[PDB]
Enzyme design. Structure first.
Site, mmCIF file in Angstrom:
data_model
loop_
_atom_site.group_PDB
_atom_site.id
_atom_site.type_symbol
_atom_site.label_atom_id
_atom_site.label_comp_id
_atom_site.label_asym_id
_atom_site.label_seq_id
_atom_site.Cartn_x
_atom_site.Cartn_y
_atom_site.Cartn_z
ATOM 1 N N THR A 7 47.812 49.855 41.698
ATOM 2 C CA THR A 7 46.398 50.486 42.023
ATOM 3 C C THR A 7 45.471 49.431 42.319
ATOM 4 O OG1 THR A 7 46.094 49.732 39.732
ATOM 5 C CG2 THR A 7 47.118 51.524 39.642
ATOM 6 N N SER A 8 44.220 49.966 42.689
ATOM 7 C CA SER A 8 43.041 49.116 43.164
ATOM 8 C C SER A 8 42.543 48.203 41.656
ATOM 9 C CB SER A 8 41.899 49.937 43.782
ATOM 10 O OG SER A 8 41.771 50.753 42.893
ATOM 11 N N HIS A 65 47.391 41.273 41.682
ATOM 12 C CA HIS A 65 48.196 42.016 40.709
ATOM 13 C C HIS A 65 49.429 40.766 40.727
ATOM 14 C CE1 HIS A 65 47.332 45.951 39.795
ATOM 15 N NE2 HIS A 65 46.781 46.220 41.088
ATOM 16 N N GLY A 66 50.270 40.740 39.690
ATOM 17 C CA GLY A 66 51.390 39.857 39.860
ATOM 18 C C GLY A 66 52.542 39.845 38.786
ATOM 19 N N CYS A 93 48.766 38.904 36.402
ATOM 20 C CA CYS A 93 50.109 39.275 35.403
ATOM 21 C C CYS A 93 51.097 38.278 35.559
ATOM 22 C CB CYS A 93 50.277 40.427 35.336
ATOM 23 S SG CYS A 93 49.310 41.960 34.818
#
Lengths: 146, 93, 93, 146
Positions: free
Chosen positions: A34-35, A93-94, A135
């Site tokens: 997701t953005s 993100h991660g 994350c």
């Protein structure tokens, strides 16, 4: 001269150094990620904050895994002789040990290795700061009342 | 004389190992908001580790998630300072 | 008011993530030798993170392995400070 | 009274707290782990160092994975109300995220979880320090000349 202790890094070089901000907000559809709404707010806050600390800020947006690696490689090959330090901010993100390019993951170790004391000599002995907003897993902290 | 190739690195993680990292769609991530606020207020006064410690306390105490999904509601976050630095770091001189 | 359940933890690792940790069969581990030396000398003077930073520098600069096995010869080590603390820590008051 | 800032932990409780030192030197033959010569030197140095910091030091030697977990569980169930902090030192063989009992591994997360803010209320808001002397992998740092 008088007693010299050297307990703090020398931060009076001609330049404080570079502050590379990688802001990934939009990811390739095929990734299903997701953005990251609001990340531009973070990117702008960081640009201004480090600008006031006299860092040469460079903002990059929506970079693929390939561009992230290429960017870091190119930056690590620059001559940082006149720079006091190096700062890299990663917004994406991660997962644990991973940061996501727009089209896939990048091991954080691969990114930081470019700046190893033996691979970026103009930064040897100088502080290399990596700020990571991403994350590191899926655990949630329920917290405890105080 | 040699130094470790991993020396002089500081990783300022937004969250603890294995945890989600929270972000407010309108105000930005909890960590970055707090980090910038503390740098703006203390960069000309405190050593970096102490600045980051204030960031930890700010994030830990001032933020909590709100969600219609019970699974993600009322959650907290603590940043994670990982230092391999060999000296104190002041942004000023 | 709530705080993260992971808050107020400090992990003083002897070595960086993924690395071996060195020990001298006669003097003890590089990290523990250095940690005790710095605590003895600075516990009544410096904040804990700053003490640990001196430990990082001591281990990074004063130690290097010697081995007949080229694989383990002339290696270095950098400790790893992992803080989730929310306040400065002084052993004295 | 005057301005109160609370930037440092309250360390003037009646007691500084416990300092649990787990010293594993001899491992069960079936594990194939070598004895950690010199670790007693570390254990004694730590006992004396923390004694001078006024911590109630408790040294434990050659504990199995079961005894390590039992010890930590029992310690976390003690009343730490009058203690300023908690310190645990782990001296043993290990891998990333793991510490070895004499007969097998113990996830560090399992050990530290006992002291979570919600699981050990008498330590909530107080510093919990874990000092870990053990491998976190097999990588070797070749270093770089300065």
């Amino acid at each position: 001269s008088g007693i010299s202790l050297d307990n703090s890094y020398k931060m009076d070089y001609p330049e404080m150094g570079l502050c590379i901000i990688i802001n990934n907000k939009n990811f390739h559809k095929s990734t299903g990620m997701t953005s990251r709404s609001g990340t531009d707010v973070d990117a702008a806050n960081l640009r201004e904050t480090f600008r006031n600390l006299k860092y040469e800020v460079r903002n990059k947006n929506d970079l693929t895994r390939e561009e992230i690696v290429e960017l870091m490689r190119d930056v690590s090959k620059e001559d940082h002789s006149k720079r006091s330090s190096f700062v890299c901010v990663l917004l994406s993100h991660g997962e644990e040990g991973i940061i996501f390019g727009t089209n896939g993951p990048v091991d954080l170790k691969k990114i930081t290795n470019f700046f190893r004391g033996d691979r970026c000599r103009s930064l040897t002995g100088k502080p290399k700061l990596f700020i990571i907003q991403a994350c590191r897993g899926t655990e949630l902290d329920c917290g405890i009342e105080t | 004389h040699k130094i470790p190739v991993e020396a002089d690195f500081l990783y300022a993680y937004s969250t603890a190992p294995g945890y989600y990292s929270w972000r407010n769609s309108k105000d930005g991530s909890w960590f970055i908001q707090s980090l910038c606020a503390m740098l703006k207020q203390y960069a000309d006064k405190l050593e970096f580790m102490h600045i980051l410690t204030r960031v930890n306390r700010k994030v830990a105490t001032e933020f909590e998630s709100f969600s219609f999904d019970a699974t993600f509601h009322a959650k907290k976050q603590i940043p994670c300072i990982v230092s391999m630095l060999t000296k104190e770091l002041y942004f000023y001189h």
